[PDB]
Amino acid sequence: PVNYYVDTAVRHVLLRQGVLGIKVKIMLPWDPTGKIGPKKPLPDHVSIVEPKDEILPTTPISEQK
Amino acid sequence: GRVRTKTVKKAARVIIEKYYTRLGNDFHTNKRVCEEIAIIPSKKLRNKIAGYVTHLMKRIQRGPVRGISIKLQEEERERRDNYVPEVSALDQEIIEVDPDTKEMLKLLDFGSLSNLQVTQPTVGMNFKTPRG
Amino acid sequence: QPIKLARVTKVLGRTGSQGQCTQVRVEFMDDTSRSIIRNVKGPVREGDVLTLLESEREARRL
Amino acid sequence: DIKLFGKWSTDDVQINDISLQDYIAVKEKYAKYLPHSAGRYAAKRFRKAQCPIVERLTNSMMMHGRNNGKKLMTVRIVKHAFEIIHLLTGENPLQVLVNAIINSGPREDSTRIGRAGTVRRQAVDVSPLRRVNQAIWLLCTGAREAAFRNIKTIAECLADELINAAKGSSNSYAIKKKDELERVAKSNR
RNA sequence: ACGAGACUCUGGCAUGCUAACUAGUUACGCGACCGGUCGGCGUAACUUCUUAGAGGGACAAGUGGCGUUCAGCCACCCGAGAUUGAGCAAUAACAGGUCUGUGAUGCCCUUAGAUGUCCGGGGCUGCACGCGCGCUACACUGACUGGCUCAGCGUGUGCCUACCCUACGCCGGCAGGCGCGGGUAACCCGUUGAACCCCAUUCGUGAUGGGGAUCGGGGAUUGCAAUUAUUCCCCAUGAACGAGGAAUUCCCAGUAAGUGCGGGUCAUAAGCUUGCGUUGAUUAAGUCCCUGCCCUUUGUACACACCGCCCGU
Ligand SMILES: [Mg+2]
Ligand SMILES: [Mg+2]
């Protein structure tokens, strides 16, 4: 995931006394289709669909259509 | 080492607590259920979660589990806990009573009780564990 | 003294400077009622037979 | 009808040691035409007890660097010296090998002191598997250094080594080493 | 929450799916030899074999024990597989290495009889000696000589840039040389006819036909030059070495070790390294004994932290 969730850059800065090295790492947010970040979720992230609230039928009802 | 990580265990616990009705003792049906109701980005992780779900289903089959808490299961559990004997264990024809508690009851004004049977007191005053 | 066999009834543990000996419980093939602890040098498992040339020492517990 | 090579039966081989009966595999499920079966007996502990004893000898023959992995040469060296044991003794070579294995395995030997120690040695008993392993190793070593720098070919040194070990003679390197180990264990009792 | 795991690549399974004249296999024709053998020719079937996509498949899932009957561990069945191997890898630190990789660099130094840059010639190898990694051995479980028969990973004609991999024919013991073609590559080398190993032969226990250091005389190749001998070939010569003291290294399965082969380096070139197959084990399923390294409690007068601190003549 480090190859598509974090974007890295390394640069040099020429100053009077010498070179300063700067490293910038950005961890992209999960973006479903829209390019702000990766489309794939993190492999260890498990999302469980919330079950919808059903009502148990008390008596057998037959619906004719 | 086949020790499951917390990812697998928490995922399995949540899946069981949410979809206990759809699950059973079959690994190959449980894994399909998991892949239908959840979003697991890996097949190996899905298989591990389904295996632990099967293990936990077997565990709940013979009692309770400290991690799971199923709302419908608690009603049946307290229904089992609603056992009531035919005759109350506190309803005794004769209950033994020491002379001291008999005197206390007499001072309470309840000295007319009939079920009391005044048993003999102890003889030796040896109720302490020897020191050493 | 004669040479006599003994069947292993349970593996007690590992002993030695480098854990090279298995300390084990053995019951005698003929008597079948007297048992001792001995250290055996090599891979040992349930039910195999050790021939004891000496047969009355006892290995030290633990 | 699964004679080794194509000539040596197994139905008549009697281990008659009780202790090593479960660790010498020669008789019915372990009757094979050749002492070469690839096999995965090193994968799990104790499985090598399911390996036929002739294949264990064959594997132990590939030793001292220049002969590593040359298993066809070693199966040839066993086929010969079985042909030679039969000529010298008149008995089944498998029986001679089994008797040699029984006779050449130490029963006691010494380890470093008991629970702990760094001065002397303490006598202990030998596992049956370690007995068979040590017997094979000693027989192979005796043959190997009998054939070294000598016109006597291998498959002659090994045959005579196995014959002497079956006889219990002290002309055998394996018997000498077994006696030496057993005596040292006796002294450190 | 980071790290571990998960993850990606990779190894094993699929007669199930997708589909192939730059892969094949069956079948059928036509031929060559004695129904059989045809890497002989040709074209239907098709996809087992070959490629490579999608999906499937294993979860300690089943059974029996051990466990707080939990987390898990052991054994067994079924199964292609019941622990394949790598890649990536936290906080924090080292005065670790690199200014000799850079049009990365701050300060110094030098800058025209230059520390810039070409161009000759030396050196980098020089040899009383000490120390590492290694190669070849000390043979018969072997050398020699014929015969037989099996791989895999892959690399091939270049910006500058000269320099590619080679079949086939001929000439020459040989190393080579000369003509002719294919290939920018599942198309040609190539069906990669590897070595060990296998089969037979001669030797016959000794420095021997083991072993090949050293050295002489010839012959070629690449290069602008081969001497201090680039490399290769031939014929001669034929040293130590008979298994190695104290002391040490690396290793748990297609593994160690034998054995060749490719890539890099490369005008010329592997005793190196990085990969690949091939033959294929002994032993172990454990422990803190040695060596480390972690903790935990404990002591400190240390905190630049024991390479500390500190006392007296
Ligand atoms: Mg230690
Ligand atoms: Mg201080």
Q: Where are the domains of chain C?
A: 1-62
Chain E bases having any atom below 7 Å from a protein CB: 4-8, 56-62, 70-73, 75-76, 82-83, 88-89, 104-106, 139-142, 196-199, 204-205, 242, 253-254, 256-258, 279-289
Strand partners, C40: C22, D125
Please state, in angstroms and rounded to a whole number, the distance separating the CA atoms of residues D102 and D138. 12
Give the technique used to solve this structure. Answer: cryo-EM
CA dihedral of residues D27, D31, D35, D40 (deg, nearest 10) = -90
With beta carbons under 8 A apart, name residues in chain C contacting D183: none
- Token pair belonging to B131: 């020191």
Please state, in angstroms and rounded to a whole number, the distance separating the CA atoms of residues C50 and C40. 8
> What resolution, expressed in A, was reported for this entry?
2.6
DSSP D52: B
D4-187: CATH, from 2.60.40.420, 3.40.50.300, 1.10.455.10, 3.30.9.100: 1.10.455.10
Q: Please answer whether residues D74 and D58 qualify as being in contact, where contact means their C-beta atoms are separated by less than 8 angstroms.
A: yes
Distance D90 CA to ligand 2 centre (A): 90
Please state, in angstroms and rounded to a whole number, the distance separating the CA atoms of residues D143 and D183. 23
Amino acid sitting at position B85? P
- Token pair belonging to B41: 């980005």
Name the residue ranges covered by the structural domains of chain D.
4-187
Class of domain B1-61: mainly alpha
Residues in D whose CB is inside 8 Å of some CB of C read 18-19, 22-23, 45-46, 107-109, 111-118, 122, 124-131, 133, 182, 189
Chain B residue with minimum CA distance to A48: B38
Please state, in angstroms and rounded to a whole number, the distance separating the CA atoms of residues D49 and C58. 29
Please tell me if residue A53 touches chain B, with a CB cutoff of 8 Å.
Answer: no
In the sheet with C4-15, reading across from the earlier edge strand, the strands are: C49-52, C4-15, C21-28, C35-41, D121-126, D108-112
Map tokens 């089992």 to a residue.
Answer: B80
Please state, in angstroms and rounded to a whole number, the distance separating the CA atoms of residues D97 and D119. 38
Which of A40, A43, A49 minimises the CB distance to B38? A49
- Cβ-in-10-Å burial (0-12, 13-18, 19+) of A41 comes to middle
Q: Are D114 and C39 an interchain contact pair (Cβ–Cβ within 8 Å)?
A: yes
Closest residue by Cα to residue D174 from D122, D123, D102, D126: D102
Please state, in angstroms and rounded to a whole number, the distance separating the CA atoms of residues D169 and B69. 76
Which of A40, A43, A48 minimises the CB distance to B38? A48
Q: What does CATH list as the number for C1-62?
A: 2.40.50.140
